[PDB]
Design a protein around this ligand. Structure first.
Ligand code: NI
Length: 341
């Protein structure tokens, strides 16, 4: 059944709860972002109101074929009424179109649901600074102090310089970037841009990127692989076998591949800086794992929660085992005591 942590008390609202059949009493289904764990169950046959950002709305229409009448896009940073309840959507700093949702309850409670987020100090000067938040429904993906990672800016810097050097040493070297969902477009766009190429991809992925209101996008991407030296591939196909495979297809136009696997956290974060990264090599093919996260580090999450001073925190991630639940509850208490709320 739909779990309590997907239900908004005092409303008929649910968040990211599309795979339980009909949910009894739900009058509006909110969708935080277009990632399959969150949208799972949506299709052309859904006939209930979906509320989401304009970008997520494009993806529901064009990729899932949900019928326009059931898609209710809302502007960000704007007080809106939904079945008689004041709500605001805010940028979640996750993937394109991803939002947090502020619910203002008739009883006077204020609830923030973060969807998936990477906390940032910039959020401390959004509409959140304006009033008190009583309940936080929190993206707890990396809620443990071993989870450090560098800034997005540091990670893009590294990838830019790595690829530029490699291609300038060898003009017949091809760059490949893995993907399996939206998000992390900056990796392949910033590399494409330093190399004066467009990025080349399948027609399915091109369609996906054309929904995202990215400015000047027609100048940045293409479906003509031949014209491009930055290729996007399914993340599955980023390994030496599927790379060699792919290298055959380019027909002697390239003799080397330099490939990137944008990972979340991996255990070399606990010993190795971004400056000191190395790839896995097999001949003319190299693979860099780079830790580009679109989720909060443990410290970023800690700071956001200590700024917000919520009265109750309900985790939405890693809730499936008693050990995780108990560990999280400990950090929540530490934070509270350190900060005096
Ligand atoms: Ni996500």
């Amino acid at each position: 059944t739909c779990p309590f942590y997907k239900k908004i008390p005092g409303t008929g609202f649910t968040v990211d709860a599309f795979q339980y059949g009909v949910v009894e009493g739900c009058t509006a289904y909110f969708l935080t972002h277009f990632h399959s764990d969150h949208y799972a169950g949506l299709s052309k046959h859904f006939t209930f109101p979906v509320y989401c950002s304009e970008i997520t709305g494009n993806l529901l229409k064009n990729k899932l074929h949900v019928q326009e009448q059931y898609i209710h896009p809302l502007p960000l940073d704007t007080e809106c009424i939904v079945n008689g309840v004041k709500v605001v959507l805010l940028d979640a700093n996750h993937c394109p179109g991803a939002v947090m949702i502020l619910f203002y309850l008739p009883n006077g409670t204020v609830i923030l649901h973060t969807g998936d987020f990477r906390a940032d100090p910039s959020m401390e000067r959004s509409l959140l600074a304006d009033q008190k938040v009583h309940m936080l429904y929190l993206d707890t993906t990396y809620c443990s102090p071993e989870y450090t990672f560098p800034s997005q800016q540091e990670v893009i810097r590294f990838a830019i310089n790595t690829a530029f050097e490699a291609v300038t040493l060898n003009p017949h070297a091809l760059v490949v970037c893995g993907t399996y969902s939206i998000g992390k477009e900056k990796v392949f766009l910033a590399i494409a841009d330093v190399l004066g190429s467009k990025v080349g991809m399948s027609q399915e992925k091109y369609k996906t990127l054309q929904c995202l209101n990215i400015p000047e996008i027609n100048s940045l991407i293409t479906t003509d692989m031949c014209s491009s030296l930055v290729h996007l591939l399914p993340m599955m196909q980023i390994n030496f076998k599927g790379l060699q495979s792919h290298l055959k297809k380019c027909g002697g136009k390239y003799n080397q591949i330099l490939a990137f696997r944008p990972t979340g956290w991996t255990h070399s974060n606990k010993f190795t800086r971004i400056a000191d990264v190395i790839p896995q090599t097999k001949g003319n093919i190299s693979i860099y794992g780079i830790p580009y996260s679109e989720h909060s580090s443990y410290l970023e999450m800690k700071r956001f929660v200590q700024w917000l001073k919520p009265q109750k925190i309900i985790p939405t991630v890693n809730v499936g085992t008693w050990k995780s639940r108990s560990t999280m509850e400990k950090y929540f208490r530490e934070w509270k005591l350190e900060a005096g709320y």
